[PDB]
Design a binder for this molecule. Sequence first.
Ligand SMILES: *[C@@H]1O[C@H](CO[C@@H]2O[C@@H](C)[C@@H](O)[C@@H](O)[C@@H]2O)[C@@H](O[C@@H]2O[C@H](CO)[C@@H](O)[C@H](O)[C@H]2NC(C)=O)[C@H](O)[C@H]1NC(C)=O
Length: 77
Amino acid sequence: LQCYNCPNPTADCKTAVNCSSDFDACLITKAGLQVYNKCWKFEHCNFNDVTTRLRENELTYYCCKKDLCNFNEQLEN
Ligand SMILES: *[C@@H]1O[C@H](CO[C@@H]2O[C@@H](C)[C@@H](O)[C@@H](O)[C@@H]2O)[C@@H](O[C@@H]2O[C@H](CO)[C@@H](O)[C@H](O)[C@H]2NC(C)=O)[C@H](O)[C@H]1NC(C)=O
């Protein structure tokens, strides 16, 4: 999956790059402050496998399966 991967927790990442290996679900987390951007698994995209790996909790991780679907446009209802 090709998604944007930033070196820091910014709220406007625009660097498109292929996702590392062992990654089939793009992840777009938003802890009301920083829009995390990283390649995540579809099995680890639950309400415990992400808030634990990042060592956080209050956040809305949204996994996707489209070349670049973790952008900042899928968490504003
Ligand atoms: C992500 O990687 C792809 C590499 O795709 C390869 O080429 C495809 C045509 C297909 O054969 C895949 O199975 C291959 O793995 C990048 O796409 C190519 O990248 C090369 C080198 O950068 C470039 O010369 C080609 O023209 C590109 N072709 C296409 C269709 O993209 C792609 O750009 C990478 N994306 C990012 C954000 O890095």
